[PDB]
Amino acid sequence: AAIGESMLEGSSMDRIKRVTEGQFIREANMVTENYRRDYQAIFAQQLGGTQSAASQIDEIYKS
Amino acid sequence: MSKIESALQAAQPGLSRLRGGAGGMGYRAATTQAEQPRSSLLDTIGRFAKAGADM
Amino acid sequence: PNGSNYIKTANPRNDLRMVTVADYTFIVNRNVVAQKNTKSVNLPNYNPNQDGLINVRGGQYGRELIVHINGKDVAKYKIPDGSQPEHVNNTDAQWLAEELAKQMRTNLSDWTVNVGQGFIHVTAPSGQQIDSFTTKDGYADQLINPVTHYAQSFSKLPPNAPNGYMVKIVGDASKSADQYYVRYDAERKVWTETLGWNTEDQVLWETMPHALVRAADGNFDFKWLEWSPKSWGDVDTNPWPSFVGSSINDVFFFRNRLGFLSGENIILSRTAKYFNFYPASIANLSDDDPIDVAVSTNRIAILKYAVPFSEELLIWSDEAQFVLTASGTLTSKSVELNLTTQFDVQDRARPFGIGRNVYFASPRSSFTSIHRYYAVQDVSSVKNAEDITSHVPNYIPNGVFSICGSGTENFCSVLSHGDPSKIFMYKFLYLNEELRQQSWSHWDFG
């Protein structure tokens, strides 16, 4: 809206919007990546629990 | 030879990218789920023993 | 190209108005009335009951999954207790979706159902349709929920879905505030807001104003202008532009917005996209949205002329004169319209803007009388249009078809078809808003 009524146009006037659109893309990329870290943590916890159950079953069997 | 410049005087259409209101992306799927081949193997050993080697 | 029926009529002077920007000249025919294209529709006879989805969030041990379709519990699965490690596949989301689809196929052979990335899609034959679509899982719907084309809240949409799926939000179910459609995009994995099913778009691309564009070779082309179609919502949520029913009287450009004057409605385009008169998206009122404001006052005012300026936009009616201005940016909420004067304006006047002054003709019984209106920025100082041809009320025949003039040589030419052999000069000179010279004369060429 502002770059449309300016009466200037050009390359710098498009760099203003391009940089802004980039900030939103990077911020969303962070939401999409914070999720990946959380899923990785859940994965590690699940593997740890499974390994603990495995070791406990070995202990029970060994008597 | 000459070039039309009205589209430059305006926002020339279909050039790079146009955005609407796209929402609800949801990112991606997951890399499978925590696999338990180790525990399945161990429990198979346990049952095999508890059935055949535990008379 | 594209025909030439737009330029017709035995009186082009009184039926054609156009304004030119670099390399385009938009032409609007006052007699032609815009219409909506009934042939163009997204989904002509869409049946929202044709298909559905079954989002599978996950599996919990010891629960039971039931799919109820058309009164039949087609699918029934009992997840094991969970003592054996082999139950990992049984609780897996994709394995469970495949099992549910297999059971549905066994209990519904004719129906076609295919497994998705995180869902089961049910597509009934054309003859039949889905009436009842409910699922019971015993875990407060945290494992699987039924998804149809009507989803209450935005978050209810499944994370993944077929590429062409369409869903309507209808957030309130009793108000029109939150009604819009979103379709999934497989490749991008994003739900994109799009125009609803069985909804028209485009305005036939013919009755709308055309343009005269200079081609690359240096010649000129006459064609319609590619307008933008509706991008979201049905007719109840994205109403047609007010010009779609009536004709367009004038074409102008204010603040970089292609504007039209249809009936009592002033219609402006987007800040930069001149061919897009519809808003962007119904999610949050945007800044560069089109303006379709209607003047509301005691008298139904038919807008006739609109001479623009750098920051003001004079709007003239038969017995009204408004000024559409906005402090800052014209954003459809900061737009302010204020009545200024109430002098009479005739139908066939041809205003010409020489700087602030705008000269318009007011025909009389036999001889026209020119008028001048100043465009002072201070609305509190506005004065009714003057009559420069007061000492010479005659001397101009009743029919005037051009009031073109210059601003650097300080003159205003007037042409009349009553005596087409004469050009009427009006030489003036203003020193600090002071009338120094007034000269009236004609140039008789034979």
Alpha-carbon span C265 to C300, nearest angstrom = 10
Q: Tell which B residues from 1 to 55 touch C, by Cβ distance under 8 Å.
A: 1-6, 8-11, 13, 20-29, 33, 35-36, 39-40, 43-44
Method by which the coordinates were obtained: cryo-EM
Rounded CA gap, C79 and C96, in Å? Answer: 9
Maximum Cα–Cα distance across chain B: 96
Q: Could you tell me whether strands C72-78 and C357-362 are parallel, antiparallel, or unpaired per DSSP bridges?
A: unpaired
C50: contact with B, CB 8 A cutoff: no
Joined tokens for residue A26: 């990077």
In chain C, residues with a C-beta closer than 8 Å to the C-beta of B25 are 189-191
What b/e readout covers C185-195, taking b as 16+ CB neighbours within 10 angstroms? beeebebbbbb
Torsion of CA C306, C313, C433, C369, to 10 degrees: 10
Q: Which residue has the tokens 């303006």?
A: C291
What's the one-letter identity of residue A35? Y
Contacts of B45 in chain A (CB under 8 A): 61
User: What tokens appear for A44 in the block?
Assistant: 């590690």
**Secondary structure class of C49 (helix, strand, coil):** coil
Residue C306, amino acid: A
Q: Could you tell me the CA-to-CA distances from C407 to C184, C205, C354, C359, C416 in Å, in that order?
A: 57, 38, 5, 12, 21
The answer to whether A9 contacts B38, with C-beta atoms less than 8 Å apart, is no
Q: How far apart are CA B7 and CA B28, in angstroms?
A: 38
Count of alpha carbons within 13 Å of C13, Cβ hemisphere only? Answer: 12
Resolution in angstroms comes to 3.2
**Cβ–Cβ pairs < 8 A, chains B and C:** 90
CB–CB of A4 and C331 under 8 A?
no
Q: Are the beta carbons of A4 and C271 separated by less than 8 Å? A: yes
Our CA-based measurement puts residue B52 at a distance from the nearest CA of chain A, in whole angstroms, of 13
Q: Which residues of C198-227 are buried (b: 16+ CB within 10 A; e: fewer)?
A: ebbbbbbbebbbbbbbbeeeeeeebebbeb
CA–CA separation, C114 and C301 (whole Å): 60
Q: Which two tokens stand for residue C21?
A: 């920007």
The Cα-based distances of C212 to B10, C21, C23, C26 in angstroms read 16, 11, 8, 7
Interfacial A residues in 16-55 facing B (CB < 8 Å): 28, 31-32, 35, 39, 42-43, 46-47, 50-51, 53-54
Q: What one-letter code names the amino acid at C289?
A: D
Q: What is the token pair recorded at C416? A: 């009349």
Is residue C65 within 8 A of residue C79, CB to CB? The reply is yes
User: What six digits make up the tokens of C342?
Assistant: 């109430």
Long-range CB contacts (< 8 A, 24+ apart) of B14-20? B20/C192, B20/C193, B20/C194, B20/C231, B20/C232, B20/C280, B20/C281
The DSSP bridge partners found for residue C314 are C307, C323
The structure tokens listed for C4 are 């030439």
Inspect the interface and report whether the beta carbons of B28 and A4 lie closer than 8 Å.
no
DSSP result, C389-414? GGS-SSSSBS-EEE--EETTTTEE-E
Give the CA count within 13 Å in the CB-facing half-sphere of C423. 11
Distance (Å) from the alpha carbon of C143 to chain B's nearest alpha carbon: 16
DSSP conformation letters of C275-298: T--S-S-TTS--SS--B--B--SS
Contact C226 B13 (CB under 8 A): yes
Query: How many C-beta atoms lie closer than 10 Å to residue C330's C-beta?
Result: 26
**If you ran DSSP here, which 8-state letter would residue A28 be given?**
H
Cα–Cα nearest to C371, from C341, C344, C398, C342: C344
CB-nearest to B34 from A32, A43, A60 is A43
Query: C331 and C304 in contact (C-beta within 8 Å)?
Result: no
Name every residue whose Cβ is closer than 8 Å to that of residue C327 and which is 6 or more positions away in sequence: C334, C336
Distances (CA, A) of C244 to C113, C239, C248: 43, 10, 9
CA distance, residue C255 to nearest chain A CA (Å): 5
